[PDB]
Amino acid sequence: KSAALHIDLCKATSPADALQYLLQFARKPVEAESVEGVVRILLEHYYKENDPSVRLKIASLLGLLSKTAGFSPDCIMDDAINILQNE
Amino acid sequence: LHRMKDLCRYMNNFDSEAHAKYKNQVVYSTMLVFFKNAFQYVNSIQPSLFQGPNAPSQVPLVLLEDVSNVYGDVEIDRNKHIHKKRKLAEGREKTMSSDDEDCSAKGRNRHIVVNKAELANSTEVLESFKLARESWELLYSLEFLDKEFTRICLAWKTDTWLWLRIFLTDMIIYQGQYKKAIASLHHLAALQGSISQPQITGQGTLEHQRALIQLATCHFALGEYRMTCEKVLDLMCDLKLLPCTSKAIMPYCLHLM
Amino acid sequence: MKLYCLSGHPTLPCNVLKFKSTTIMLDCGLDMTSTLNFLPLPLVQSPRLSNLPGWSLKDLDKELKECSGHVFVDSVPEFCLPETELIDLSTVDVILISNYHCMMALPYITEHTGFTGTVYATEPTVQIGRLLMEELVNFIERVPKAQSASLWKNKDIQRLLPSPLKDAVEVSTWRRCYTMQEVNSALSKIQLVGYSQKIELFGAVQVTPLSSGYALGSSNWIIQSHYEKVSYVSGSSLLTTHPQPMDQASLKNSDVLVLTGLTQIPTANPDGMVGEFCSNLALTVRNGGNVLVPCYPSGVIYDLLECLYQYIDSAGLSSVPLYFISPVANSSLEFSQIFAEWLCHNKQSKVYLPEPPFPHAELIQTNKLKHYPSIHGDFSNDFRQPCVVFTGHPSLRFGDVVHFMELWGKSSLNTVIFTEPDFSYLEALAPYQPLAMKCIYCPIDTRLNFIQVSKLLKEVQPLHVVCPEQYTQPPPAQSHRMDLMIDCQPPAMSYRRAEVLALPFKRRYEKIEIMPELADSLVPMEIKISLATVSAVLHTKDNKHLLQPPPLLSGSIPVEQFVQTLEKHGFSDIKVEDTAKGHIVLLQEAETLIQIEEDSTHIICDNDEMLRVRLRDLVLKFLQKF
Numbered sequence: 018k019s020a021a022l023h024i025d026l027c028k029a030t031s032p033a034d035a036l037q038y039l040l041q042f043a044r045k046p047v048e049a050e051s052v053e054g055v056v057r058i059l060l061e062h063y064y065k066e067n068d069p070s071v072r073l074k075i076a077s078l079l080g081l082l083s084k085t086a087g088f089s090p091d092c093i094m095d096d097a098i099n100i101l102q103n104e
Numbered sequence: 105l106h107r108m109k110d111l112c113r114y115m116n117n118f119d120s121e122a123h124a125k126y127k128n129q130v131v132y133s134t135m136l137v138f139f140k141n142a143f144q145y146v147n148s149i150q151p152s153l154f155q156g157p158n159a160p161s162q163v164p165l166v167l168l169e170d171v172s173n174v175y176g177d178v179e180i181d182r183n184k185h186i187h188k189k190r191k192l193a194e195g196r197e198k199t200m201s202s203d204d205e206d207c208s209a210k211g212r213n214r215h216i217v218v219n220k221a222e223l224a225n226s227t228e229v230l231e232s233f234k235l236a237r238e239s240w241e242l243l244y245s246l247e248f249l250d251k252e253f254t255r256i257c258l259a260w261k262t263d264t265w266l267w268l269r270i271f272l273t274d275m276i277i278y279q280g281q282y283k284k285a286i287a288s289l290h291h292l293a294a295l296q297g298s299i300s301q302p303q304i305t306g307q308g309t310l311e312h313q314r315a316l317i318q319l320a321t322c323h324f325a326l327g328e329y330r331m332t333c334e335k336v337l338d339l340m341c342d343l344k345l346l347p348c349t350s351k352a353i354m355p356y357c358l359h360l361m
Numbered sequence: 362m363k364l365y366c367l368s369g370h371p372t373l374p375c376n377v378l379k380f381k382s383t384t385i386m387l388d389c390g391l392d393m394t395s396t397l398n399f400l401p402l403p404l405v406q407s408p409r410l411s412n413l414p415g416w417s418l419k420d421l422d423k424e425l426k427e428c429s430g431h432v433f434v435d436s437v438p439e440f441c442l443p444e445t446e447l448i449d450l451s452t453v454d455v456i457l458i459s460n461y462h463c464m465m466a467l468p469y470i471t472e473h474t475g476f477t478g479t480v481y482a483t484e485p486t487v488q489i490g491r492l493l494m495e496e497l498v499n500f501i502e503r504v505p506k507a508q509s510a511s512l513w514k515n516k517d518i519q520r521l522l523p524s525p526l527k528d529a530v531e532v533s534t535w536r537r538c539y540t541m542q543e544v545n546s547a548l549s550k551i552q553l554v555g556y557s558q559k560i561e562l563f564g565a566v567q568v569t570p571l572s573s574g575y576a577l578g579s580s581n582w583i584i585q586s587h588y589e590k591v592s593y594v595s596g597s598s599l600l601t602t603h604p605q606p607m608d609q610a611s612l613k614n615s616d617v618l619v620l621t622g623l624t625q626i627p628t629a630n631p632d633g634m635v636g637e638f639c640s641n642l643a644l645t646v647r648n649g650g651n652v653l654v655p656c657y658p659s660g661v662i663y664d665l666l667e668c669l670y671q672y673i674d675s676a677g678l679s680s681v682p683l684y685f686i687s688p689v690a691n692s693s694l695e696f697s698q699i700f701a702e703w704l705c706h707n708k709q710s711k712v713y714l715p716e717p718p719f720p721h722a723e724l725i726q727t728n729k730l731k732h733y734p735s736i737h738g739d740f741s742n743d744f745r746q747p748c749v750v751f752t753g754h755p756s757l758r759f760g761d762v763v764h765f766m767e768l769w770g771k772s773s774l775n776t777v778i779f780t781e782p783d784f785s786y787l788e789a790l791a792p793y794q795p796l797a798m799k800c801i802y803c804p805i806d807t808r809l810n811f812i813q814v815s816k817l818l819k820e821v822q823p824l825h826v827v828c829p830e831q832y833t834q835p836p837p838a839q840s841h842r843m844d845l846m847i848d849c850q851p852p853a854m855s856y857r858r859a860e861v862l863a864l865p866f867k868r869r870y871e872k873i874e875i876m877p878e879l880a881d882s883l884v885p886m887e888i889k890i891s892l893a894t895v896s897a898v899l900h901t902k903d904n905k906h907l908l909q910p911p912p913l914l915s916g917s918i919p920v921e922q923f924v925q926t927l928e929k930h931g932f933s934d935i936k937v938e939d940t941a942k943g944h945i946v947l948l949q950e951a952e953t954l955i956q957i958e959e960d961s962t963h964i965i966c967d968n969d970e971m972l973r974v975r976l977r978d979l980v981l982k983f984l985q986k987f
Contacts, residue, residue: 032861036859036861037859040446044533044534065305065306073448077446099157099158103159103160103302220959
């Protein structure tokens, strides 16, 4: 889910609880049409987050999501290259 | 830094035709000095707003009250400490809230006691930082430069513009008007958080915290100790020593108090 | 500086440290206790387990089975892996294996996770681990069972299940047993290392295995970068065990001492428990009953076998047979025998004169110990009823131990004796609870207890200690024993599963070598201590830095000495201007000027270029670079 993940990542503590929630979320699959919203939220939290391990897990997760079904990732590579430049 | 003492030494309200060359030279020098001061203020106090989307977007700094000067023996006033603190801070010049303009003569009334290692330069950088108010005041003395500065502030949306906001924050910081700095701090949260450019986003913004600390310092200079303490608590959750990080802003709030 | 902990199990750790330019995996570990939630795999389909009543809920029923209140899973046992998705294991450069117990789960990491690094371990560890995966795969694939059970893994369904099944964690990450092809592939990616062997990893860090004394080939690792050393203390023992004792000396001067593999059941003295085990089985055998001893084929079985060899002669029980049933039984006995140089000084002295080290060769020679590969072979012909059998997995979920539990479980005469503490003997025994069999728990754990590790810590004095969070609190069974804790002068930071620890051991001053050619051109000075200046080109190869041959100044130049000493060193017509806290000196030739500040000097040239270099050099008479 999109809003549920957003609010859960907002309310979770930065260093460990957010990492655990991302770990739980990475296991369960995501429907292709909903990939855009969840990766947008992950990017927003990537900008917010200061911890390196949490950002690393966000990068790994949002790379994993790009392999899901016939999803078209041509809309999520400008923000990806941007955050890569800023990382 | 000291070149404005010669340009401003001529007749401010000189003849448009008889002294056309002198007026044009004075206006050009005033505009250049104002641009240099704005650029320096933006670089020193607005590191996040001056950085693009692919830039580092570092934590911005801020300028605080000269509390060290009052504590130091250079400005050890035996009977000018309680009521003259606002006077020592602003010089009773920046009464009005001047956006993108600094109307203050504190550069000549006092100085900045900076050693060789405390600041970047004991002659160049310190004088350039202190003379910004004097150069801007000299520019405001000339009608053409003042009109150009006012037009720039009006057209550029000085609250939204990075350089003009930094200049306004520096002017309010030295003036002691905590309300302008508080308004800038409030606008520095939503402006930075809602912009797609790379900066400090959300309530925990470095620029917003630095502006809040500057507002606390201005309130302390104005004598409103309760307001300064409230601003310091909110932030926690001519020259001065302060780091550009947001973490160091919290431990420096109590210095003004 | 970093440490990714991929497993919350204390005695089965999986830690990765992103330290320097290499990420090193410390142990693999396989949390075998997840198998206790599943129904056991029998060699022959039993009527009792097949006809167990399914569990009831408001909805499923065939996935879960109930036996004497406990609820189990009617599916193939699954194993809780370390967290593989926390850190991309493709980035792991090296894996260090300490024990054969920690050697498991390695096929998962090596095959499924895209790991292309190297694995380093000692040869007895490799061989015994190979035997363990051999017997595990043999047990699992002997009589295969389907994996139909997946509904109970659901997040909203697991909450309503009873306690043993509800408290299981990382259930979605459980995997079935690796195939033998994966085992063979994994062990092909291994490098055998001896004790105190210095292995260089890309010229960055040096790792040596050090003998831990806990098992054959058991090793502790120390990783060092020539200034910062990280010590990894896995399962170790300071008792009179067969392997050579702990090399405690090499752990000194350690910035970080990551500490795992401490004993379970710390209150138990292993010698007393060995004596109790022997006495209990002697009592059972004397009354005509049988004895079942679930154990690993190569672990603590040898020590208790030696004690049994000593005990039976005095006990007058030489007639009864000592059966050891496992697919890797003969391999275990032979590997234990041949690794004679991996023993202590007392037992490695048996190689001088011709004699096998272990005494169970004499048990075989006198036909006291009889090892078999399974139940269906010659064992069923040579089986005598009042016997003692070492077999099967200690988990009581697969192997021949399931068959023997189902066979002898109906009589009070027979007994089952648990010696491995890594499995909860009440939870492993859960799918058989209404038995009349006499169940005895006398675990034999020779690993370090908290007194021993406290003494070792005070001997070694590490700057920081890393341990599982289970050791920073007393065990839940006691919950009041302050002696069962890791007490350190530093707080001794801890970790849980999937926790990332930012270690504070970040240090500067990496080592570099300077060749004689450049050292010839380097000349020192005197200050207040020696000092020199170096200008060279840096050559780096395999993370080893070499200095190939191709602002600040310091000294004592006070205003008085400045005015006096260099007054007439070659020029003329010099005036001194009475400046505050110093003096300003300028010459009339072209208004060339020299200004001094407090603890500083600088030279000004005005329309002159030739004399400026000599002006600088004159001041350089007594100016160093400190």
